[PDB]
Design a binder for this molecule. Structure first.
Ligand SMILES: Nc1nc2c([C@@H]3N[C@H](CO)[C@@H](O)[C@H]3O)c[nH]c2c(=O)[nH]1
Ligand SMILES: [Mg+2]
Length: 278
């Protein structure tokens, strides 16, 4: 299944370690329309995904496709300014490749972000939802980045996922929000991932909500599974970019354009939160 050898991850971590002096302790993966979180890094050193051996390439609008090292609020971080998705043609073992490289780089905590359509009726476009848990739909069928022989050098054969999203960090993230001075509070809930690229139908939307999901996207989950597998501390949030249409009369239609726009209108609020969070 997984086509990368332990040495492939090594090779790439070796490459990065010899091209930058930066020794990141934290990794941030910036979802759709969230590339601006790169803006405040100091001593920033950028590498295009195209120049890093073994790295996949971002082909979705709103994904720069650059890995940026730097300092943010005192912390040494490496940011994925743009990510990879299954709908682009990538098996999960490709999508999550950076995650294992980060572990090899010496990173200890991974913060994942994404743009998600809201399923919980109380969410509003612009809301930031702390990811308390997830439902891995592709995983139900075996589409899993861990599928195939297990590399004990990364983790165990059957890793647990019920404690995936660090509770401490969600506690902190909430008080940090207090300091934000934001009107609307920091939401929290279950994120469900499905393949995409098409947006949901009304039946699907109703179905997903009844599964207990608050937000839906086409990313994040596989990165978290790989992160946990290799022991990374995980924290994640979705920016509610649109409310998925749950009725046959709504003239509304989900679209990537509005999603990127909502990301832009919130990258500021997100900029400080993630930094103060640092
Ligand atoms: N499944 C799904 N994804 C998204 C997204 C995310 N952003 C991109 C689509 O705009 C995809 O990568 C997806 O993960 C935003 N809104 C929605 C939505 O309503 N449904
Ligand atoms: Mg430099």
């Amino acid at each position: 299944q997984n086509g990368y050898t332990y040495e492939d991850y090594q090779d790439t971590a070796k490459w990065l370690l010899s091209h930058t002096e930066q020794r990141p302790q934290v990794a941030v993966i910036c979802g759709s329309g969230l590339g601006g979180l790169v803006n405040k890094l100091t001593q920033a050193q950028t590498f295009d995904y195209s120049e890093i051996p073994n790295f996949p390439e971002s082909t979705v609008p709103g994904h720069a496709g650059r890995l940026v090292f730097g300092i943010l609020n005192g912390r040494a971080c490496v940011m994925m300014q743009g990510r990879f998705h299954m709908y682009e043609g990538y098996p999960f073992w490709k999508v999550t490749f950076p995650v294992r490289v980060f572990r090899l780089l010496g990173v200890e905590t991974l913060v994942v972000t994404n743009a998600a359509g809201g399923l919980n009726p109380n969410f509003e476009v612009g809301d930031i939802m702390l990811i308390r848990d997830h439902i891995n739909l592709p995983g139900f069928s075996g589409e899993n980045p861990l599928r195939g022989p297990n590399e004990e050098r990364f983790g165990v054969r059957f890793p647990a996922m019920s404690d995936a999203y660090d509770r401490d960090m969600r506690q902190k993230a909430h008080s940090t929000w207090k300091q934000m001075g934001e009107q609307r509070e920091l939401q929290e809930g279950t994120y469900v991932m499905l393949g995409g690229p098409n947006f949901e139908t009304v039946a699907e939307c109703r179905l997903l909500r009844n599964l207990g999901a608050d937000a839906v996207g086409m990313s994040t989950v596989p990165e978290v599974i790989v992160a946990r597998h290799c022991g990374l501390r995980v924290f994640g949030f979705s920016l509610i970019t649109n409310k998925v249409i749950m009725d046959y009369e709504s003239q509304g239609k989900a679209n990537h354009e509005e999603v990127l726009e909502a990301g832009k209108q919130a990258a500021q609020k997100l900029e400080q939160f993630v930094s103060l969070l640092m």
